[PDB]
């Protein structure tokens, strides 16, 4: 993002994500099996787990659970 003062130009292969496979339809992108380690994942997941805890709204709870499922199990 540019909000951290980055430009696309100073980005080497190491800034790019990786997976084993991806598929995209007319309107559906899907990433199977990322290279990100289950340390980092389970870390980030436990963060969004505490987003639900302090989501004081209802529509705010809906989205958060969605990403947690996108990251934890499946949908």
């Amino acid at each position: 993002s540019e909000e951290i003062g980055m430009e696309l130009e100073k980005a080497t292969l190491e800034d790019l994500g990786q997976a084993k496979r991806v598929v995209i339809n007319k309107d559906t992108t899907t990433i199977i099996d990322g290279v990100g380690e289950e340390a980092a994942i389970q870390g980030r997941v436990a963060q969004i787990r505490q987003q639900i805890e302090e989501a004081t709204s209802d529509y705010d709870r809906e989205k958060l659970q969605e990403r947690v499922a996108k990251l934890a199990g499946g949908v």
Partner: protein, 75 residues
């Protein structure tokens, strides 16, 4: 606060005391904000920014109260 230039002198005296800084301005808009962000992000100097309480006349007086509690000068 639009122009980062206005911060520089202060932001640097704060980089010698090694202590973080809270910026309570009337507002911190596009230009300056984006910068502060970039700066605080790279672990340069820890800084946060927040709008002043209320609006109109009391804002200035309420900001002033804040000065008193903290022993600082309204600018």
């Amino acid at each position: 606060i639009s122009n980062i230039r206005e911060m520089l002198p202060v932001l640097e005296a704060v980089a010698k005391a090694g202590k973080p800084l809270l910026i309570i301005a009337e507002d911190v808009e596009g230009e300056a904000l984006a910068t502060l962000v970039v700066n605080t992000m790279r672990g340069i100097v820890k800084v946060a920014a927040v709008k002043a309480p209320g609006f109109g006349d009391r804002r200035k007086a309420m900001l002033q109260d804040i000065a008193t509690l903290t022993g600082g000068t309204v600018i």
